[PDB]
Amino acid sequence: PPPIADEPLTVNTGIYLIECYSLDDKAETFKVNAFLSLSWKDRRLAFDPVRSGVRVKTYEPEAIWIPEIRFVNVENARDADVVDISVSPDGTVQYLERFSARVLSPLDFRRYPFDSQTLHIYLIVRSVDTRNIVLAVDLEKVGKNDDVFLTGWDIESFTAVVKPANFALEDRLESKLDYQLRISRQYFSYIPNIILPMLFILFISWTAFWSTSYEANVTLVVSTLIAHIAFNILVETNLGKTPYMTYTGAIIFMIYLFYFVAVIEVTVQHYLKVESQPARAASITRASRIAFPVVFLLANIILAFLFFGF
Amino acid sequence: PPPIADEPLTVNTGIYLIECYSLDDKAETFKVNAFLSLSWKDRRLAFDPVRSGVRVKTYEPEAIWIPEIRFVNVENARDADVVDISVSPDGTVQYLERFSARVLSPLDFRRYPFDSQTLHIYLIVRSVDTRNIVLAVDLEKVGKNDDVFLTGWDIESFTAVVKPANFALEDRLESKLDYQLRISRQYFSYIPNIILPMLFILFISWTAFWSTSYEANVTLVVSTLIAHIAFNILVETNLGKTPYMTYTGAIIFMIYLFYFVAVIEVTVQHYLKVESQPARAASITRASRIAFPVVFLLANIILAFLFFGF
Amino acid sequence: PPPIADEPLTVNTGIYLIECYSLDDKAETFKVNAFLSLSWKDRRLAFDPVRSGVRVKTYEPEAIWIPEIRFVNVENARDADVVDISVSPDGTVQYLERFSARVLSPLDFRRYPFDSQTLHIYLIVRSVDTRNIVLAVDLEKVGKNDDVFLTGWDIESFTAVVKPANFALEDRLESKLDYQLRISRQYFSYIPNIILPMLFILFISWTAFWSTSYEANVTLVVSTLIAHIAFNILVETNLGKTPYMTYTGAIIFMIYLFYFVAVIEVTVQHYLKVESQPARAASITRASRIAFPVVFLLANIILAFLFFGF
Amino acid sequence: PPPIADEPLTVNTGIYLIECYSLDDKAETFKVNAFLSLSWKDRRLAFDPVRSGVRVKTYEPEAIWIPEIRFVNVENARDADVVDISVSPDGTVQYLERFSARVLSPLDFRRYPFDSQTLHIYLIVRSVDTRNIVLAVDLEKVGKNDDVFLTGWDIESFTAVVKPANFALEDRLESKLDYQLRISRQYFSYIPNIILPMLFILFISWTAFWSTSYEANVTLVVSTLIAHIAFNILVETNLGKTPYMTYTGAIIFMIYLFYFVAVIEVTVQHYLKVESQPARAASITRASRIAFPVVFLLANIILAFLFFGF
Amino acid sequence: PPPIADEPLTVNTGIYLIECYSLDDKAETFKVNAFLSLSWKDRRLAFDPVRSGVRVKTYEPEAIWIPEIRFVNVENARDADVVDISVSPDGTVQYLERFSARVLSPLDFRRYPFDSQTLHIYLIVRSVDTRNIVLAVDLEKVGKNDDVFLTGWDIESFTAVVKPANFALEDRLESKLDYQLRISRQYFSYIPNIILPMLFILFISWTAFWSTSYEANVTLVVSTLIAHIAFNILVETNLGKTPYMTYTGAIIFMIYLFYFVAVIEVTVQHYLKVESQPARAASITRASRIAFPVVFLLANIILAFLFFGF
């Protein structure tokens, strides 16, 4: 029983985040526990304050017509508890629910350690007969409770795109809104826990540029190659595999390259030396002592600028 | 209270995908959040437009008789919220629900990295007394919302097989439909993340074809064999094990072969050399430098053509 | 309000498997989505065909008395949707629900790679006052939908034990039925993925029977021992650990024995050689070249016959 | 509407285990599917046998007052289906439900492989006005269905402590009962799968007491140290980590000790030999050949007696 | 129908923890099963003791107005069962439910092995018209059942902050309470299971300060580096990765430092020795024998004081 009106019915929305949590880097989802405030004029149940009742009259969701506000990018239904309903004498209804849902918003790990994400919460309403348009009341949208957090992240801003996107879906318009939670990853431990140890093992590997014994250098390079893979297993992360090409996966691919040419060099040095030609061997090794750290530094500056400064 | 008719009742179907997600390569399932549009003529509740009411009359699922549409290949029930019911003056009902279910469709990984899948959604309806036959309305079947995604995949087409499969199950005919979601894996990272590093370690392994020391070559081949397994553990995937013989599992089996015959070669070279016969040893090793990369390239071309070009 | 009869009430059962899935080798459970058809004579609601109504009359589960059919070996309750209820003029009721439950049936992995399982579905009914006995209608029991599958398995037969087991539980008899889903594992990949590579590494291990250097043989045997464990980690399976002694675990234990006696041999060969006695050393090594593959083949034939041929 | 009596109301209890499963060694929980039988005299609904009705009268839980029996150590609520209610002519009620719950009972792994556990199920009842005291009827408590199992365990006895513990909680007495499920771990595979292979690798480790090359012994002891950790990773168990000190963790700590002093010895032997003192070196090594197996056997007998024989 | 009063309505709260469990170090959540006692004066249903009824009158939550008490930091809703409602002759209501919820409270692992946590449970109540303020009754807050436990922890004190935080949220005040569960980790096994073996491998690593062979020292240091990583994988913990810098992660980073400079030393020792300069080589090695354990002990004392004694 919708409210008969003279023109499109505006339903004012608003989300107050109480809790944010369970940011799943794998499934690109996150869980939210928030408020949902809705308001619309339904003069059909406007009441007399002086004639009877009081300043404001409260109803049960059974009694009144409520706009069906579904979320778009939610896995299941939006687990909801109705907190309050308050009708104004002119017919202005004030709806407030406390919901919890896991939202499905895509994540872009192309800069994995130093990346920022913008989660989405989408609200729509299908139009039964009178056309329905959702808009946002800023005062009810101040969604961030101060003590709301994602442990690995910093929370920038929870805001909303005021302009709705009025679709046309199966011979009926729909009004879509766009709530946006802006986060940015906080990455202290990655320098001590991930990168620096992975560079320690790699340096150890090309300590064989000051050595001559093929046996020691293979027990050097190859044994450290196992340590690299073993350490990668130790620091295996939920998004270590990604369909697109990440940044962290480029330098991690380059690390796998610098073990190959390290094996290539000690093999070349060994062949040159064993083929009565040590002048060339101990010259390639001398060069490697500088060539490897520079080509590394270079290609990492090339790679850093490739993803970040571009 | 079914609709008494003169002949079989057609129920027009249609599914509008709102969300696709959680494609489980292990359990061969995937989650879907979509619309379900149904329409059928029930002149038993045809209404008078002019005499009373308006253009269209809305009912509650309790009031009217609704056709029971079950999904076949769904794990549990199909979590549904009824969005709208709209009866037409002639008695044409317009049903619309928004459901979410995890569907069970078999996946064929015989070409794992470069594979295409056709997910299925099966609709059936049992016949209470009047025979029931489902068919599809293309206009309500345009299932793909533009911003729907599976992160590892590209989405080709959401279509439906217009011809139903009319069964006979326990003295009652049933009508089954076939909705098809066609996907194809997107595999950028696999060359840098999986294949190339796994080929690097194998090349390192047969660097012992330019070496003579049995100690170094066993510390060579065998140490890299550990690196192969360790890297396979690092890049362990949900479907690495499969009951049938995959492609990726064939070349991965061949990799395990080329470590054996590499150990076979360095062992033969060592025996020939130690049995006062170095002419033959350093001749088999000379051959290995070419024999191994070619038989590999060949058998991989043989293997690629075996699965793909056939 | 149960049906007053003259003697025990028979309730005819039947299960039509629509889906089988999620065979959990660990928890010895599996998920099923099937039909459940029940029928009993309740002349208390026999109706007059000509005098009124039609051929068959439909009721709501509220209206009628329904026998409480519980499952025995189900984790929780049996998620049920009532599909149809159809009473016959003589009072014969036709109940049909579509349920989904995860069943708990023990699994016997004593032949793990090549094993067959018989899953159970147990139905019981307690007797309120009139004694209740369940039996099976074969026509409603044809449970296998043709396109039902467990990916790792072949599905032999879904049948039912016609004879019920009538218990006596807390001063009231109960009638138990036994539905049996017979499966047998399909094991293509195990030869290429599990057994053959695990035999490759073991062959590599005792290549030290054609070598003399203790350093190479320890970097041989011991380095390959790590590869065995690492590969076992790579191919770790849900049921690798079991309280009873499996088959695959016997040969996997034997593999661990042949590394010990391999270390024993190379240590003994080294001691004999270093104690100015090379005649005996290079004689024990000569023998090992034949003793190890034969005792293996033998003890594996002994092991195969022990589990399978007995 | 509680039953007015003359003195405290006794409620007779009883639990019939139908299924036991999902014994979670980590979370110290386990799942149970059982019967719950309750009986109490409520002469307020004693009925006339001859004047009307029959031998026994059945009610709906709505109609009658039922004692609220909660479980203490259950995670959530206790998923219940009401099977039967049977009132006796004198007013004796016979309640029977079939519940399923996961119970929370602490586990003591101080003897992990060879340990016995006593799981608990706690029943309490708060007193509304008349004081309530629960006790057990032995005939309805025979909880073990014969074919009930925990795969890794043997089930000794399901019994109950007849004496309740009558508390006083928030100005109201409560009556607590103690049901006890006694299990003892069945540990066949642990000798072949865990201990024996872990002892093999340790034996291999101190095969370096019959060797002189420091290179072979470091490629011996240290390479086997990796194998120990890798095998521990292969046989990683749910309760491998525990806050208290387990038995299995003591001998596993001692294994880590015997690798250190093995490295200690070969280093000392190498130093003594290289410091022109081979008489002392080859004398410490001679001693190690006996000292290590004896101190091991000893300290394990010391450790076995410390946990078990004490 | 709220209770009309003369001034703000006080609602007295109280939580009796029955069970604590599932402390999730990863998601910083924990599960609780407790009582919730509420009391407020609603003279609107004050009753006449002598005129009718008895001492206390029981209602159904339907009949009475109950304050909506929500939890703030809970994932979903708070699974609740109403145990008792008791109205006093003056109009004082006694509400009592038994709930179970998983709470979301941040955890600080900056002292991981030796850390104490203070979990929070937050109660609020929105004000319908009359202002609502919650406060705590100490007698009903005695939350700790004696036999309540977290296996890895000791439970210090369950108390509550008597002063509420009265907010102003969307043009309506709310009253927030703060319940505090104080725990402290109990860390016996960490010395035998985590630290001591990880120090054993590190000691083994720098046993190469009493050796001269570059081959043995690289098969020494590097082989133990794999063992360090492998052992870290064996002892992988839920919170091993954290966005902030933990204590345990600092000393674990230092361990990674002492493997690098250990390789640096043996490489420098080898270069000095091979560059006809053994006086300097065997002098740097002599110094390392003391410098490494002291700088370790030092930097660990510096590190311990840095986190704990500051």
Numbering used by the authors:
A (entry chain D), B (entry chain C), C (entry chain B), E (entry chain E): 7 to 312, 317 to 320
D (entry chain A): 7 to 316
Quote the study that presented this structure, word for word:
Whereas ELIC forms a cation-selective channel with high conductance that is activated with high efficacy by the primary amines cysteamine, propylamine, and GABA, the cation-selective GLIC is activated by protons and inhibited by bulky positively charged compounds that also act as open channel blockers of the nAChR.
The introduced conformational freedom upon replacement of the restrained amino acid proline with the flexible glycine has resulted in the rearrangement of the M2-M3 loop and the unfolding of the C-terminal part of M2. The remainder of the helix has collapsed towards the pore axis as to maximize the hydrophobic interactions of residues at the extracellular part leading to a structure, which, most probably, prevents the permeation of ions. In contrast to the large conformational change in the extracellular part of the helix, its conformation at the intracellular half remained unchanged. Remarkably, this pore conformation is very similar to structures of GLIC obtained from cysteine crosslinking of residues at the domain interface, which were previously assigned to a locally closed conformation of the ion conduction path, the structures of two nonactivating mutants in the M2-M3 loop and a recent structure of GLIC at neutral pH. When studied by two-electrode voltage clamp electrophysiology, the GLIC mutant P246G shows dose-dependent channel activation with an EC50 that is shifted by 0.5 pH units towards higher proton concentrations. Another distinct nonconducting conformation of the pore region was observed in a high pH crystal form of GLIC and in several mutants of the same channel, including the structure of the mutant P246G determined in this study. Thus, to our surprise, the mutation of a conserved proline in the M2-M3 loop to glycine still promotes activation in both channels, ELIC and GLIC.
